[model samples]
Target: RTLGEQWKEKLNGLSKEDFLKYRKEAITEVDRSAARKARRDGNKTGGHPVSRGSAKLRWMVERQFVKPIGKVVDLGCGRGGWSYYAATLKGVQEVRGYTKGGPGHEEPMLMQSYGWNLVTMKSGVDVYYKPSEPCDTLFCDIGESSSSAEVEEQRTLRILEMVSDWLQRGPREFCIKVLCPYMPRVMERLEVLQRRYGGGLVRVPLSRNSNHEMYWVSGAAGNIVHAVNMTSQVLIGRMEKRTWHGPKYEEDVNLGSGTRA
Candidate 1:
């Protein structure tokens, strides 16, 4: 079987064991007990009803988007769901969340719950600190304020500015979930900024979850890695070594290279 088949098998199973193994923090106690009791009582009465597991949806979407060895930031991250998920991955060094309400909001408690639940993963120890620096992975789960034929552009533009400021240099990646119908002018504005900054942006439509949109950016994919290596080779003789050559080694044009794409 291929990787897709394996993921399909995993999706088909979608067991509690799988949930605990991967997204240990996704389920709240209330939801857990409800599922457990539902399974128990329903075993005698009926079968599973309404098994629309959004965590599985999130995981599936992440498998399609997430990359290795980078930080994650969530803008307007309510309840920090995606942030917690990003923190679960081993390659994710750190995860930060920015909400208008700040730490006093509902996400702190959710983040705490996620932290407590993730005590078993290898990355859990590394995730036990305040997140610093802009991120490769970005999340925007902000919602619509009002349905008026007004204020949509303002809301979208605000988030675009926030996202542009929050992300680091060199083609950062993102999985933004926003309310719709999306503003065309706002997208055009973001397009201009993205072109100027050097990143690739695309939108993903989530299934069954209408009134929402997801944006993904791979950045300049493999360009940053190449540029960094080039700089390192020029300055330190090689990217892997910090040893500097004053004049003799400076002339050496060793091109150590790596590619992400």
Candidate 2:
């Protein structure tokens, strides 16, 4: 039988043992099988729905900000997904991935297979000492593991400061993931960086299933203004359908330019 037939037969089996056996076979496919396995196995490493969402956001960032050929850096590149995809783009000069290396770290090999280099460092602090040229685009999915809430917030701020340092002077772009609660502060800092680099910032929600959010900042804010403008219009259309009709509610009005469109 083909893989699909085997999957259907195993899926309807009653025994727990049969389900477990099917899971082992599910790793190779990215459809229903893979989703089930990731949830069952609790595979937080990569290739799950969460990571897939991140990939989609990355593609959007590339479309909006990245050029065909330029240097790209992936900070805390757990699965090297961004690095891997960046390397496959047209006119990409080079892609570098930074990861905290240790046993069971597959990113080095994973990125190598895609012709990208993964820079193994002792810690986040080590990335600065590695002596690399500046990049045109920076992508980070760095998160703090501190148990204390205050500590985590501070750590996130420090990471943002470091990210700001990596950005070039003008016409560069960056995308990063941060927890929802911390997004306000993150965006505050990002706004400063964006202004310093002569640009603007836009927040993109990663996925509905996840609280992780992404912020895309561009040095040439006006150049990409239309992208955000179109996105906001689309979001406004969706929001209009879900509008709350309170007792004092009135018809929607165009708040911009004092227009009655």
Candidate 3:
């Protein structure tokens, strides 16, 4: 009996995008049995339960957080692959993920069947569902926004702002994945969070394979309310303090620097 059979050669030759597309195309099951079998059984990660998203989370997300990851909310979980994997972690009590609709839009029922919450949606990043309970951890990837991930990153930043209330006031942690960025401001946002919490953009071994993505991890956040207010004043608010007054003429060069331009 050969593990590397005829079918094996076909799968092996496929590149990362190719294999993802293959997985993307085939997403239905009746017993619902065959459906997430690849995730639990492993066609991709040498028999370990790992997909690209899972691997990204598992490696980049430290196994030991500053404290337990009480209730995890995956802000834009595609297929719940990463969310499901997060559920398998030792300290995680629950996982809830939101994914907007798209191509090959079959969700792995197994994720829900096993007790993780995977909520698929009709709208895109412009919306969000409330997490049933306060969240101790947050994971977001808004889905291949290079069509774009810029939108993904942008919306994730929005959630980080708008959804601040749900993050419990103590040792809560968050990990965000982005293939894109409107980054400088984003990092400024991250920097604010890190100083308040602790943790920052870091590279893990697995991230090397994904050409343009980076993970921003934070833990021990300052009071969620405090963080949000300060963030708005320091980051989000300043962003809109001034603008182009007319048709490419006057501008506020010293926008918030106590000067007029």
Candidate 4:
């Protein structure tokens, strides 16, 4: 069966309310199916499988890292599946999802089914003013295909920065899904933000196995400054560091200050 079909089958008997009651299990199944397809497709990184590899990442973030027991904002919520799922959490008070306004059938279905507050607004240009009352948790799958690689990178970076601004201090958490290529570099930039505020970055793998591409998850609780200081020492390591120079850089030239060598 197709992936969507399988999802429909799994969700067939349950009403929206009932689904919310047991949404965690449903979300897990969605993720597991995606991961299974990813492993079998022989191209885990390619965009030919389930949910553009979002199901697996979302699964990991919602399931393993962030506890879905409070209010949340699913930034860049495309189909609203993840947002709907978060809304279904047992103790969740509210779940708000924002997208840049696109054509999709999932949003209406999700709204009718799960009663999540989904909004469509252009990010970067549109301002989602962060409020004094902070959400308990936030989740996002921001990066995706674009007209050009540069545009993609720029959009993702802006989304990350905006989310960072929205994330308030004290007992708040966030989980973001980033692409494979933008790894250690994008993460380092994000670390700069965390340093300015106060929080640590945590990298969470999509699956326990040797999954080629995975999600980068980071969260901070209590006082942005305190979280930054507390998490700054967590020692989340780096990827391959490469020093590039033009050809013929192997020859060293000695500089003479007081003495020449």
Which scores better on lDDT, 1 or 3? 3
> Which ranges of candidate 1 are over 4 A from the true structure?
1-63, 102-105, 110-132, 168-171, 178-181, 197-212, 219-261
* Candidate 4 Cα errors over 4 Å, as ranges: 1-54, 61-63, 103-108, 111-133, 146-149, 169-171, 180-185, 194-214, 219-261
Against the true structure, candidate 1 has what lDDT? Answer: 0.40
Local distance difference test, each candidate: 0.40, 0.45, 0.45, 0.42
Residue 206 CA error for candidate 2 (Å)?
3.9
Q: How well is each residue in 1-261 modelled by candidate 1, as lDDT tens digits?
A: 322223323434546653333322212211233324644454312211112222422443455553534656655555444555555455666666565553444333232222224311221112113243545666666646443323655766665665565554432566554332234555466556556554433333222211223343443333322332232222222212233221211111111112111
Distance from true location, Cα of 89 in model 2, Å? 0.7
For model 4, residues 1-261, the per-residue Cα lDDT tens digits are: 222122234444446754444323211222234335644655423222223234444445455555655667666666555655554455666766666553432232222223333222223222345442466776766565442434544655766666666665443556765432233345566656666644443433222111112233443333322232222222111111133221221111111112111
**Per-residue lDDT of 1-261 in model 2, one digit per residue for the tens?**
322223223334426753343223211112334434654565433333323433444545455744424767777766555565555455566666687656654333332222333223223334534444577777766664433434545666776666665765322656654432232454466556656664443444323211223345452364333443344343333223333331221121111111111
Name the candidate that leads on TM-score.
2
lDDT of 3 by residue, 1-261 (tens): 121122233444557764444432312211222334645664332223323455456555555422326677766665565666666556767666665655554343332322233223222433355533467776766534333334655755775564444444453577765343334445566666556556545433343222234455663333333333332232222222233121111111110111111
Rank by lDDT, descending? 2, 3, 4, 1
Return whichever of 1 and 3 wins on TM-score.
Answer: 3
Cα lDDT, model 3, residue 192: 66
Error of 3 at 138 (Å): 1.9
The candidate 4 region of ten consecutive residues with least summed lDDT is 252-261
